[PDB]
A paper describes a structure:
Closer inspection revealed that K2-31 has a near continuous stem loop configuration, interrupted by the presence of a 7 nucleotide bulge (disordered in our structure) immediately 5΄ to the UGAAG motif. Interestingly, the protein-RNA contacts stabilising the complex are narrowly distributed with most restricted to the catalytic region and the K2-31 loop. In our structure, A20 and G21 at the apex are recognized by a series of hydrogen bonds involving Y373, R248 and F249. Further stabilization of K2-31 is derived from a stacking interaction between the adenine base of A20 and the aromatic side chain of F179 located in the bridge. In order to achieve this, F179 moves ∼5 Å (based on Cα-Cα distances) relative to its position in the DNA complex. Despite use of the inactivated E244S SOX mutant, the absence of density for A19 and lack of a phosphate group in close proximity to the essential catalytic carboxylate D221, is indicative of K2-31 having undergone cleavage over the duration of the crystallization experiment to produce a product complex. Inspection of the SOX-K2-31 structure reveals a complete absence of interactions between SOX and either the phophodiester backbone or bases of the UGAAG motif. Our mutagenesis studies have shown that while C247 has a minor role, F179 is essential for RNA but not DNA processing confirming the bridge as an important factor in substrate/product recognition where it directly functions in RNA binding as previously hypothesized.
Transition to the lytic phase coincides with the rapid degradation of ∼80% of all host mRNA transcripts in a process termed host shutoff (HSO) that is thought to promote immune evasion and enable viral co-option of the host replicative machinery. In the γ-herpesviridiae, HSO is initiated by the bifunctional alkaline exonuclease SOX that has been shown to possess exonucleolytic DNase and RNase activities. Owing to the presence of a PD-(D/E)XK sequence spanning two of seven conserved motifs shown to be essential for DNA turnover, KSHV SOX has been classified as a member of the type II restriction endonuclease-like superfamily confirmed by the crystal structures of the the related Epstein–Barr virus alkaline exonuclease BGLF5 (3) and apo form.
Residue numbers in the entry: 6 to 14, 30 to 156, 160 to 164, 176 to 230, 232 to 314, 324 to 389, 399 to 481
RNA sequence: UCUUGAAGCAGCUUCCAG
């Protein structure tokens, strides 16, 4: 059914910013000579019509209450023109407040179809690398990672790394209040504070990017090459034991780089030290300089077959493994770091990677990750590698610019009728 | 039917060769 956001009444995902901009009423509005739509003003306007329809259904009508009782001055504005004019008059504290309400309204990581309509027309953390590469879209007119990976590694971080600090597992969609052309979601964040007032980001916190490599998913069999390397690591955890574990497969997660000699889009980890030898250019060089100092944190998890189901840190050590600044993950965490900074006005960012093993017949049915239980269908976690990510300001600014120009070019090509005013956007 | 090329959201997936 044709989902109309200007009406008075799956199909919830078809309430896009693309559908809003392509709509006849908006098309007739842009047709006037005086009309020069700016960003984030049009995005903020779209956010009203989206929540005037979805808001009542999804329970909380807080987004529209702020828009009407503080942005429209009690008036329940109905037409595009009035809503845009009121939205263009919004101050930064007001745009930020709407963005937070939207984030709390979409606090269900990836189960609401609102999330689907919200992502469209925005450069998301995942999609960021593609946008900076300038490759083809932004405007478009399964759980084999959520349950199987994210959940497991999240619980691992929640109960083993930060079981003392107050943490937040599920974050909503964080649209950029400064531009409205960027939007991220946080996998996990630890040591967070709450107002009165909802959640608030503190520069003394750690934001995690939960990703995991099932390349190393081995089976407890004498023959198995990965299992052989893991056993050596389990009863002797160290820098050298990790090297055997990583080079136990044909396409490894670690890569050797000469004198900062440039890596490849192979994987997320990279090592510059001798012991790991196995067999825009300038922007890459600037990033390598910043990431080659802080070591990766490696967690060897206890075997539930040996520790009566209780998975905990058997041993923890440091590895000279750094983030691949060419790989997607770096750019994904870059965009996320940029929006966190915006919602503030710094937190430490990391890539938490899980390493597993197949569940055997002799493995306990009921397993516990510190305090909370593990699903009997999912694979057993054996290792956790926490990699710090550092972003040089100059490089971060240069990249966000390239992506913004790509958004500017695509939005002007996809929507020819809209007399876009990117002079207002030029600030961010 | 597998491993070595390449390509994209994590494993798979999409085009090959031998």
């Amino acid at each position: 059914t044709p989902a109309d956001l200007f009406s008075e009444d799956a199909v919830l995902a078809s309430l896009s910013f693309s559908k809003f901009l392509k709509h006849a009423k908006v098309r007739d509005w842009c047709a006037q000579a005086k009309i020069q739509p700016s960003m984030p003003a049009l995005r903020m306007a779209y956010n009203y019509f989206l929540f005037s329809k979805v808001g009542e259904f999804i329970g909380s009508e807080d987004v529209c209450n702020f828009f009407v009782d503080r942005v429209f001055g009690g008036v329940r504005l109905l037409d595009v023109a009035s809503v845009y004019a009121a939205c263009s008059q919004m101050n930064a504290h007001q745009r930020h407040h709407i963005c937070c309400l939207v984030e709390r309204a979409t606090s269900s990581q990836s189960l609401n179809p609102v999330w689907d309509a919200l992502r469209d027309g925005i450069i998301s953390s995942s999609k960021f690398h593609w946008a900076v590469k300038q490759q083809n879209k932004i405007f478009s007119p399964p759980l084999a990672f959520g349950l199987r990976c994210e959940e497991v590694v999240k619980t691992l971080l929640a109960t083993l790394l930060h079981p003392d600090e107050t943490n937040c597992l599920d974050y909503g969609f964080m649209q950029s209040p400064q531009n409205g052309i960027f939007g991220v979601s946080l996998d996990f964040a630890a040591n967070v504070k709450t107002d009165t007032g909802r959640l608030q980001f503190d520069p003394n916190c750690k934001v995690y990017s939960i990703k995991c490599r099932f390349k190393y998913t081995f089976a407890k069999m004498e023959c198995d090459p990965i299992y052989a390397a893991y056993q050596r690591l389990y009863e002797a955890p160290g820098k050298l034991a990790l090297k055997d574990f990583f080079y136990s497969i044909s396409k490894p997660a670690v890569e050797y780089v000469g004198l900062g000699k440039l890596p490849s889009e192979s994987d997320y980890l990279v090592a510059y030290d001798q012991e790991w030898e196995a067999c825009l250019h300038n922007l890459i060089r600037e990033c390598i300089l910043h990431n080659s100092t802080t070591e990766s944190d490696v967690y060897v998890l206890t075997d539930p077959q040996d520790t009566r189901g209780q998975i905990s840190i058997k041993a923890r050590f440091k590895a000279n493994l750094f983030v691949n600044v060419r790989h997607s993950y770096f750019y994904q965490v870059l965009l996320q770091s940029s929006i966190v900074e915006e919602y503030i006005g710094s937190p430490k960012y990391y890539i938490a990677t899980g390493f597993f093993r197949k569940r055997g017949y002799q493995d306990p049915v009921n397993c516990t990750i510190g305090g909370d239980a593990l699903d009997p269908h999912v694979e057993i976690p054996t290792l956790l590698i926490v990699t710090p990510v550092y972003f040089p300001r100059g490089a971060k600014h240069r990249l966000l610019h390239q992506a913004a120009n790509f958004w500017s070019r695509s939005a002007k090509d996809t929507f020819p009728y809209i007399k876009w005013d990117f002079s207002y956007l030029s600030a961010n």
